[PDB]
Structure formats: C-alpha cells, structure tokens
Amino acid sequence: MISLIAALAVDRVIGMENAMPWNLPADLAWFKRNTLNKPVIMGRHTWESIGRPLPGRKNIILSSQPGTDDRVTWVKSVDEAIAACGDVPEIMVIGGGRVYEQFLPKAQKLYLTHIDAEVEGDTHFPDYEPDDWESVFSEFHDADAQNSHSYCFEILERR
C-alpha cells in the first residue's frame, strides 16, 4: 500500500524556495509518528531541503543522477523506488510536488495536514479529485503557544 503524507497551507502551497517557511512542531510530531519504522520515498529537492537522513526509517531518494551519500538509498524510477521498499505493509511518500504528482494515482491513503496560513509558494500539492477520497479521520487544533497557526489532521482513503 502506498500512502502520501503532506502539510498544505492555503491554496495547496507546500513550499517556497526549497523550504517550508512555517514552524508547526505538532505537525512534525504527527509526521514522525506516521512515518517511523516505514520506508520513506522523496525526491532529490526534498532530500536537500531536509538536509540529513530521517532516523528510524529507510530513506529512498529519487534522482536521475548517481547518488552522493551512501547513508540513504538512491533509485532512478518510480518502479525502482517501490521495489527498494521490499515487502512492507505501507510505503510513505513524503514529496515534494513532482514526486507527489507521480505517486498520487498509485496511492490508497492520504495523510494531510491543512494549515490555516497564507503562504507565498512555488510548489503545490497535486489537484486531486475530491470524489475519489473518503475522509476517515479529522482532528482540528487551534493555535497555541507552540503552534502559531490552527491546523487540521486528516486521513483520506481512496473509495
């Protein structure tokens, strides 16, 4: 099973200048809980944005060019990325925009954080078709002293 996990600001913005400009510790904790002990697939730009391997997860990087770091696994196509995960129950695709576009048709589940923040960005999550997806979990949180925007954790499953 392939799942996508992402945090979206207004208008599906996910990034600007290879960074995420907001800071929502509660959402990063949600990301860690939902990805730990699973393989994570990311594009090369997202690997550069994170800047280090994510511990406790098999890190698989898509790039058309040879890898430059043997602490992670490098692959050259979507099918190779999936194969490199082996026989696991759930593969987590962690972006960025180009990678989400390619894996969305293959995904059965979306873990989305909707952040009430207006961000100029240069990268968006794919337009997906709402009729294809059932919301099975949602949890809203107001802003607090640690999280400066309100946010909604949602899990959607392909109908």
Ligand X SMILES: NC(=O)c1ccc[n+]([C@@H]2O[C@H](COP(=O)([O-])OP(=O)(O)OC[C@H]3O[C@@H](n4cnc5c(N)ncnc54)[C@H](OP(=O)(O)O)[C@@H]3O)[C@@H](O)[C@H]2O)c1
Ligand Y SMILES: Nc1nc(=O)c2nc(CNc3ccc(C(=O)N[C@@H](CCC(=O)O)C(=O)O)cc3)cnc2[nH]1
Question: Residues within the annotated binding site?
Answer: 5, 7, 13-19, 27, 45-46, 52, 57, 63-64, 76, 95-102, 113
How far apart CA 46 and CA 132 sit, in angstroms, is: 27
Q: Between 31 and 70, how does the x/- string for binding to Mn ion read (CB under 5 A)?
A: ----------------------------------------
Q: Establish if 104 lies at the interface with Mn ion (CB under 5 A).
A: no
| 134-153 footprint of Mn ion as x/- string (CB under 5 A) | ---------------x----
Handedness of CA 25, 30, 33, 35 (dihedral sign): negative
What tokens does 128 get?
Answer: 């997906």
Residues in CB range of 41: below 8 A, 6 or more apart = 60, 62, 81, 85, 91, 92, 93, 94, 99, 103
Distance CA 61, CA 73 (A): 6
Work out whether 78 is an interface residue with ligand Y (CB under 6 A).
Answer: no
CB of 31 to ligand Y, least distance (A): 4
Residue 73 interacts with, from Mn ion, ligand Y, ligand X, none (CB under 5-8 Å by kind)? none
- The answer to whether the CB of 151 falls within 8 A of the CB of 113 is yes
CA dist 151 → 6, 12, 46, 135, 154 (Å): 13, 13, 22, 16, 10
What is the contact surface with ligand X in residues (CB under 6 A)?
6-7, 14-15, 18-20, 42-46, 49, 62-65, 76-78, 94-99, 102, 123
What is the contact surface with ligand Y in residues (CB under 6 A)?
5-7, 25, 27-32, 46, 50, 54, 94-95, 113
